[PDB]
Amino acid sequence: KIFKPEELRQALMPTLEALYRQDPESLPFRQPVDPQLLGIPDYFDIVKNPMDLSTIKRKLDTGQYQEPWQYVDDVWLMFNNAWLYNRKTSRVYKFCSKLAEVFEQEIDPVMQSL
């Protein structure tokens, strides 16, 4: 079972676009967290493997995923980083839970199709 890069891009990119369409919830996820710019210099002490929407998009566009689960792993790494770093009462944390709900809804029919 081998997946062509364009097969993964066509199937999976719409699920990433579904996340981008969430406003305001996708806004903290669209670019790599910049700890110095944001004034949160502890970020990289807590989050060892950053991930965000732009990076996943680039990996999809440049054929970095060989299997659907590798893309799913990156989306979930993004979510887990956000729940790990941010407090449960914070915007980023609540927004992460919304994106996880949206992603779950969108990814399962795509997985059934792949």
- Judge whether 33 and 52 are in contact, CB under 8 Å: yes
**Contact between residue 73 and residue 103 where contact means Cβ atoms under 8 Å apart:** no
Peptide bond into 24 cis (omega under 30): yes
Instruction: Give whichever of 99 and 107 is closer to ligand 9U4, judged by the CB atom.
Output: 99
The mark string for 22-61 relative to ligand 9U4 (x by CB under 6 A, - otherwise) is --x--xxx---x----xxx---------------------
Q: Which residues bind ligand 9U4 (CB under 6 A)?
A: 24, 27-29, 33, 38-40, 82, 85-86, 91-92, 95
